Design a protein around this ligand. Structure first.
Ligand SMILES: C[S@](=O)c1ccc(-c2nc(-c3ccc(F)cc3)c(-c3ccncc3)[nH]2)cc1
Length: 332
C-alpha cells in the first residue's frame, strides 16, 4: 500500500499515490498527470459522490465494472483503480486511471478542415470500438462527439460506453421506446460522420420534437411498414400529423463527399432499426478498404450484467465496488 499525497484542486480535493505527479485539471473530475511508474501521461478521474444515493452507488459499480472489462485499443479502459482509504469502513472514494487523450472530437470539427481519409480513419475507429462493445452485449446510448477521445495522433477511443446532446440520438430514443437495440449507436455514428464530412451538425434540433422533424426532412416519413410498429392508437399518429415528406437524396444532401461514404450514410441513417447496418457489417464496407482487416477487429469476452438487474442497498453496492477495487489486476 503506496504513499499518498493530498492536495486541493479548485474546490475538489485530491488524494492519490506518488506514482502520479503534476495532477493538472482537464475537467466527477478529471486531471492530467504523469505516471512515474511507466513514464506515460495519464488521466486520473475522481468520482464525485460515489455512494451518495443508491443511484450513485450502483452507477459507481457500473462504471467500475465496465471500465474493468474494456480491453481494446478503440475503447477507454483501466490502467489503475485506487482508493485512499483502507478497510471497507472508510471507503468513500474512487479514482479511475486511463491513458491520457487530451482532445475530444468536438475540438477537431472546430479546429481542422478534415480530409476524406480523416473521417475514414476516425469513423473506422469508432466502429472498431463499437463492435468490441456490441460483442459484449453493451450498447452505448450516448455516442456523440464529446464521448470520443482523440489524441494529437488522430487515435480515438470511446468514452462512457454503457453508463447512461439530443443531436446524436436515434429517433427511437427520442420516442422513449423503453426497449430497443445496438443499432442506436449506429444512428449516432451516422450523425457524427455526416458532420465530420460537412462541418455542420446534421440534425441541430432545438428540442425533442424539432429533432424528429429535422430527421424527417431528411430520411422522410415512414412507410406503413414502419408506422405499424409504433405502439400507439396515438403516440404514432403524432408523426403523421407533421406533414408528409420526400426522402431527400443523400447524394445531394451530401454533394462533394466521397460517394463511398455517402452510400455508407444511407445505411447507417435508416429510420428502421432493423435495416440499420451493424458495426461488424459497416467495417466490411468499401469505405474502410484502406484500414479494414478482418483478423484485427477483435470481439470481447462476455460481460456479466445481471447486476444491472436488481436493487441493493448503498451498503451492498459500496461493498461490491470495494471488492472490485481491490480485486484489480493491472495490464502489461
Ligand atoms: C459526456 S461529457 O462531455 C464527458 C467528458 C469527458 C469524460 C471523460 N472521462 C474521462 C476519464 C478519465 C479517466 C478514466 F479512467 C475514465 C474516463 C476522460 C478522459 C480520458 C482520457 N483522457 C482525457 C480525458 N474524459 C466523460 C464524460
Amino acid at each position: 500500500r503506496p504513499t499518498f499525497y493530498r492536495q486541493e484542486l479548485n474546490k475538489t480535493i485530491w488524494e492519490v499515490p506518488e506514482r502520479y505527479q503534476n495532477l493538472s485539471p482537464v475537467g466527477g473530475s478529471v486531471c492530467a498527470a504523469f505516471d512515474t511508474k511507466t513514464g506515460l501521461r495519464v488521466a486520473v478521474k475522481k468520482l464525485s459522490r460515489p455512494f451518495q444515493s443508491i443511484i450513485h452507488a450502483k452507477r459507481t459499480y457500473r462504471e467500475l465494472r465496465l471500465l474493468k472489462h474494456m480491453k481494446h485499443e478503440n475503447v477507454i479502459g483501466l490502467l489503475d483503480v485506487f482508493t485512499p482509504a483502507r478497510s471497507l469502513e472508510e471507503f468513500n472514494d474512487v479514482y479511475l486511471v486511463t491513458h491520457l487523450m487530451g482532445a475530444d472530437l468536438n475540438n477537431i470539427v472546430k479546429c481542422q478542415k478534415l480530409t476524406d481519409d480523416h473521417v475514414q480513419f476516425l469513423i473506422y475507429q469508432i466502429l472498431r470500438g463499437l463492435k468490441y462493445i456490441h460483442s459484449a452485449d453493451i450498447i452505448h446510448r450516448d455516442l456523440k462527439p464529446s464521448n470520443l477521445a482523440v489524441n494529437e495522433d488522430c487515435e480515438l477511443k470511446i468514452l462512457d460506453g454503457g453508463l447512461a446532446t439530443r443531436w446524436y440520438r436515434a429517433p427511437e430514443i427520442m420516442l422513449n421506446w423503453m426497449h430497443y437495440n445496438q443499432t442506436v449507436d449506429i444512428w449516432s455514428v451516422g450523425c457524427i460522420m455526416a458532420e465530420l464530412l460537412t462541418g455542420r451538425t446534421l440534425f441541430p434540433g432545438t428540442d425533442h420534437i424539432d429533432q424528429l422533424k429535422l430527421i424527417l426532412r431528411l430520411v422522410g416519413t415512414p412507410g406503413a411498414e414502419l408506422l405499424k410498429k409504433i405502439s400507439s392508437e396515438s403516440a404514432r399518429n403524432y408523426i403523421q400529423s407533421l406533414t408528409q415528406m420526400p426522402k431527400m437524396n443523400f447524394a445531394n444532401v451530401f454533394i462533394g463527399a466521397n460517394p463511398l461514404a455517402v452510400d455508407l450514410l444511407e445505411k447507417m441513417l435508416v429510420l428502421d432499426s432493423d435495416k440499420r447496418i451493424t458495426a461488424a457489417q459497416a467495417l466490411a464496407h468499401a469505405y474502410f478498404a484502406q484500414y479494414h482487416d478482418p483478423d484485427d477487429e477483435p470481439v470481447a469476452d462476455p460481460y456479466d450484467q445481471s447486476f444491472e438487474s436488481r436493487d441493493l442497498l448503498i451498503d451492498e453496492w459500496k461493498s461490491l465496488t470495494y471488492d472490485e477495487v481491490i480485486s484489480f489486476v493491472p495490464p502489461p
